[PDB]
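Is zinc ion placement plausible here? Inputs below.
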Amino acid sequence: MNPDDIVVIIGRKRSGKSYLIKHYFIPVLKAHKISYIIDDHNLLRSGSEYSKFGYNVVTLSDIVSKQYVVVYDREKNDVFFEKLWNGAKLHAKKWGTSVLIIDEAYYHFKYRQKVTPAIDEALHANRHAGIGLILSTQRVYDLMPIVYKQADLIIMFYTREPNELKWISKYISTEAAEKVKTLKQYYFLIYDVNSQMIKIHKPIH
Ligand SMILES: [Zn+2]
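Reply from A.M.:
I modeled the complex. Tokens:
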């Protein structure tokens, strides 16, 4: 197992996307002892919804000891992402290939005129860093078109919005836009960017 590819997952709240990430992707990585870092921006006072999947790294001991990491991003900042990314590259030096999971990728990967060096590395040199990416977002146009060009896999849950379908067809795949509107609840469509193939998946157990 060497997960250094880029997966984008698109789905609204309650689409079932959270279950796919938290009850499939993260547990599979843990099971195969693949390290990961989760970037979470959801300030709940009960704390991160990802707290059971990893540790908040604070001390020197944490730095060398904690393979599964949760980061609370209060900043949602380009300054923050450079630290997160530079940190992840070193995390992979320590633990081997690692996966950076971004819970609401809009904050870092939304449209910007001047794309920061780290974001550029994330999208164009991720396999050199040994960092796979899972970018989660609610709506397809939340993210720069370049993200979908650079992705290996694009996972989509049902959407009705005409704005979304036309965006999908324009920037990703017309066939995907056609089949996404046919998805039953919790079903998800997977577009493989490298094979140009679309598969519909049944809901996770
Ligand atoms: Zn963040």
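Short version: The two ends are 23 Å apart (CA to CA).
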